[PDB]
């Protein structure tokens, strides 16, 4: 028998790589429905 989880203990003295590192993953999905997120369309000063 084992409990299926374990806590990390992070204490500030640990070596590099034993330290806590936040992660975020931007997963994204494509083109089966209307384009609904995208970047700022860069724009420039108006000339005539």
């Amino acid at each position: 028998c084992y409990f299926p989880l374990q806590s990390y203990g992070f204490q500030p003295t640990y070596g590099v790589g034993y330290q806590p590192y936040r992660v975020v993953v931007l997963s994204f999905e494509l083109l089966h429905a209307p384009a609904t997120v995208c970047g700022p369309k860069k724009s420039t000063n108006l000339v005539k």
Binding site: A33, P34, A35
Partner: protein
């Protein structure tokens, strides 16, 4: 193509019951990038 488009017009009228003989065109109200099928609709009324 998944876009849901509403067009609309408001006007004053002074008439008893029927849809009025006359001409007017609906301006576009809003367009929503929804991406759902629609095959049936229903209306919401005040009690």
């Amino acid at each position: 193509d998944g876009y849901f488009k509403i067009y609309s017009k408001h006007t004053p009228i002074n008439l008893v019951r029927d849809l009025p003989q006359g001409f007017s065109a609906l301006e576009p109200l809003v367009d929503l990038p929804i991406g759902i099928n629609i095959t049936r609709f229903q209306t919401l009324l005040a009690l």
